[PDB]
Design a protein around this ligand. Sequence first.
Ligand SMILES: CCCCCCCCCCCC[N+](C)(C)[O-]
Ligand SMILES: CCCCCCCCCCCC[N+](C)(C)[O-]
Ligand SMILES: CCCCCCCCCCCC[N+](C)(C)[O-]
Ligand SMILES: CCCCCCCCCCCC[N+](C)(C)[O-]
Ligand SMILES: CCCCCCCCCCCC[N+](C)(C)[O-]
Ligand SMILES: CCCCCCCCCCCC[N+](C)(C)[O-]
Ligand SMILES: CCCCCCCCCCCC[N+](C)(C)[O-]
Ligand SMILES: CCCCCCCCCCCC[N+](C)(C)[O-]
Ligand SMILES: CCCCCCCCCCCC[N+](C)(C)[O-]
Ligand SMILES: CCCCCCCCCCCC[N+](C)(C)[O-]
Ligand SMILES: CCCCCCCCCCCC[N+](C)(C)[O-]
Ligand SMILES: CCCCCCCCCCCC[N+](C)(C)[O-]
Ligand SMILES: CCCCCCCCCCCC[N+](C)(C)[O-]
Ligand SMILES: CCCCCCCCCCCC[N+](C)(C)[O-]
Ligand SMILES: CCCCCCCCCCCC[N+](C)(C)[O-]
Ligand SMILES: CCCCCCCCCCCC[N+](C)(C)[O-]
Ligand SMILES: [Fe+3]
Ligand SMILES: [Fe+3]
Length: 647
Amino acid sequence: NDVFEHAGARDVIRREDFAKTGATTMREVLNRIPGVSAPENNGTGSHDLAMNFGIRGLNPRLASRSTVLMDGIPVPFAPYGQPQLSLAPVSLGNMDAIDVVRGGGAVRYGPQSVGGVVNFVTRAIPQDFGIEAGVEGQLSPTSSQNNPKETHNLMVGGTADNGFGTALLYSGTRGSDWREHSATRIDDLMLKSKYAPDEVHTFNSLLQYYDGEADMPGGLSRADYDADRWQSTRPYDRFWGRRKLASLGYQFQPDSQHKFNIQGFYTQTLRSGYLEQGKRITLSPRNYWVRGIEPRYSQIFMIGPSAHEVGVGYRYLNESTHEMRYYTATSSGQLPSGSSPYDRDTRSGTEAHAWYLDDKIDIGNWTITPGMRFEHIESYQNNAITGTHEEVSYNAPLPALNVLYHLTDSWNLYANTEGSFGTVQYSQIGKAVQSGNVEPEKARTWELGTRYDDGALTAEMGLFLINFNNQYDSNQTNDTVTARGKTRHTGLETQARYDLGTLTPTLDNVSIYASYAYVNAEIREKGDTYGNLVPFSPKHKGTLGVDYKPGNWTFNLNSDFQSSQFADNANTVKESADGSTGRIPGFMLWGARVAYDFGPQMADLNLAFGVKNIFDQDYFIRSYDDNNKGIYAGQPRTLYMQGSLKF
Ligand SMILES: CCCCCCCCCCCC[N+](C)(C)[O-]
Ligand SMILES: CCCCCCCCCCCC[N+](C)(C)[O-]
Ligand SMILES: CCCCCCCCCCCC[N+](C)(C)[O-]
Ligand SMILES: CCCCCCCCCCCC[N+](C)(C)[O-]
Ligand SMILES: CCCCCCCCCCCC[N+](C)(C)[O-]
Ligand SMILES: CCCCCCCCCCCC[N+](C)(C)[O-]
Ligand SMILES: CCCCCCCCCCCC[N+](C)(C)[O-]
Ligand SMILES: CCCCCCCCCCCC[N+](C)(C)[O-]
Ligand SMILES: CCCCCCCCCCCC[N+](C)(C)[O-]
Ligand SMILES: CCCCCCCCCCCC[N+](C)(C)[O-]
Ligand SMILES: CCCCCCCCCCCC[N+](C)(C)[O-]
Ligand SMILES: CCCCCCCCCCCC[N+](C)(C)[O-]
Ligand SMILES: CCCCCCCCCCCC[N+](C)(C)[O-]
Ligand SMILES: CCCCCCCCCCCC[N+](C)(C)[O-]
Ligand SMILES: CCCCCCCCCCCC[N+](C)(C)[O-]
Ligand SMILES: CCCCCCCCCCCC[N+](C)(C)[O-]
Ligand SMILES: [Fe+3]
Ligand SMILES: [Fe+3]
């Protein structure tokens, strides 16, 4: 119930709720959260290794405006210098839950906090041995792509009587989606451990080996799209990479009033691939190394008629990179490789020191949590070809305050203001932008909401306001930084679920639920785009649906819907011939599912068949600045089957 007690916008979706929609990816689960926009694979991330998602209208491309973690470990192969998840070493099949925090935690978590912190919770180590396995297969009947897409997960673990536990988590993907040239292969292997010799000392560890490769469909011009919206006109495009992670943690807790925690992690990441760029085809190998140590201490003490849970923490993180780009002439058939001309050879790095200190105070029905995070960051960029060495160092004080008032025994009110900031990225240390120089990005967020729950009606609603000093794009075609200027994000986020049986035995076990968010993301920067709408930001988005669980059966019906959106800061309504620019329409989709549980006992065998986009409703999205810009056919009627086994 921590979320119910959270002084800010927050939503956690637990594993038992993934399957409801036949969600096989992270994106498909995040999309169902109010205020979260996780678009279909497109642009640089036109495949399943990357992750595209943004909240409250923040650029959703490569989830670069959010602090995304896994069990507290930074997922980005470069948390400060390049937050972009062209490669996302995470998998839905290994998580117990997905915790999204849009407001209320920009103190303990940073740095790219402006767009909420998303924490993926890894499956727990079996209390006393256990096995679980699942698999889904999808087919796109109307698509020309006949290769199916199957994903699978495996969990083998247990805990010895000596307090030692270890779980083997394995998630894998294979197949192609509804687009031609999208064959994928992902293998997510993790070794998780925990050793609690007694009840004061406890150790944990995480070892991961992620390896993947996927063909990228790419966008289509309008002519091609109309001709055959399934095809791919980007034959050379392909992405791949592997991540090796190691994390060791320790916890000392002598009593219920004192807790000390320290964690150290290390990640080595490699992500590259081929890509048609202009008249050249390129191979871009990029390697990253991350090291960080993070001790933190909390103490609970009572001063009079109030309890004070003071929290203090530090974090040292060090990252280094190395990126190169080999090339050939697209004119030739030849695909680039080692021992070909290269035109980019850089090595960047960052060393960050982050300090945070907060104090949760419970006084009567209140719970005030003043907080403070401060970060001193120093990054560099050594260009081996030009020979230049550029360095930057800045500080980021980030005050914050969270108040929560318990209206009643099952209804809260909240308000908060956190500070967030996006570091200056490597890809922009140069600083080639019309507004003078590039970054850092400072932003202040204000929220106000209420959360309600009573075992029959669970609902929530909240308002938000975010001011950003600036925001920079990418434009991969000409290697330049697209400014935009100050932007403001204001809106409302809400959702609810209700047990209709509470109204009549006729609808016993029938539950309805809806989620909605109004988002107004505007560009306040004085100029030519002043007043325009931030790109890829639907003013209206949400879901609705009804679950019916009679006996061992489970019937699900659901809908997704959203309004139109723009593709460029210029807010061009008229589509271009290459289909990269223009207005993107809204749409409403419908999906359904039927599932049965043979003897919940026995072997917890679960079976299920369903459909996505039942009415084969047509729609699309555009990639504006990426090298494979163009129209991307949205997902058409898709059939799928699921299987679950628990021992
Ligand atoms: C790799 C998984 C193979 C699954 C075999 C099942 C075929 C997928 C078709 C799902 C059936 C959907 N439904 C409701 C329309 O019948
Ligand atoms: C317990 C089953 C878990 C399967 C472990 C799968 C191996 C992961 C290693 C990736 C190697 C991929 N490959 C084909 C490129 O060699
Ligand atoms: C290859 C052996 C790994 C040795 C690297 C040295 C680790 C020193 C880092 C301290 C880790 C502290 N702790 C408990 C937070 O994990
Ligand atoms: C007894 C309290 C001391 C524990 C405080 C935790 C250590 C954090 C201090 C690290 C100092 C880092 N550095 C290089 C930036 O000075
Ligand atoms: C127990 C807290 C551990 C904090 C240790 C603080 C690390 C600061 C080390 C600065 C030296 C960095 N380096 C790699 C460039 O040598
Ligand atoms: C031994 C710990 C005492 C060191 C003070 C660090 C607490 C973290 C507070 C962050 C605010 C830092 N400051 C000075 C820039 O305001
Ligand atoms: C039986 C005594 C209960 C104590 C009631 C004390 C109320 C103090 C009001 C706290 C208001 C805090 N603030 C800044 C958020 O408005
Ligand atoms: C209203 C309660 C005060 C909360 C303490 C947090 C500091 C808020 C000050 C940030 C103002 C930022 N700015 C430039 C946008 O005006
Ligand atoms: C039935 C008794 C009515 C009690 C109303 C008292 C609630 C005080 C309202 C201030 C709470 C503000 N907020 C958003 C920070 O929680
Ligand atoms: C009484 C504190 C409750 C928090 C509600 C305060 C919202 C004030 C929002 C105005 C922020 C304006 N701005 C641009 C200067 O940041
Ligand atoms: C069906 C239960 C009726 C309970 C009567 C209590 C009314 C509480 C008001 C609901 C709170 C709604 N919400 C989302 C706006 O916070
Ligand atoms: C003048 C611009 C004002 C914009 C009005 C947009 C707010 C629409 C939000 C309605 C929320 C409805 N509800 C109950 C479903 O949450
Ligand atoms: C007394 C038994 C009659 C039950 C009343 C059935 C109405 C519940 C609605 C069925 C849910 C259908 N589905 C697949 C769309 O979720
Ligand atoms: C006046 C407020 C605007 C309300 C529009 C609400 C969003 C409904 C979702 C858009 C679905 C559009 N359509 C026809 C393509 O399905
Ligand atoms: C249109 C697809 C329908 C397939 C539904 C798949 C669920 C497996 C069938 C469960 C039958 C259970 N049993 C024992 C009650 O007959
Ligand atoms: C090296 C790749 C081999 C991966 C095999 C992974 C095992 C997952 C199998 C899921 C079994 C699902 N179920 C219920 C249908 O039996
Ligand atoms: Fe890129
Ligand atoms: Fe790039």
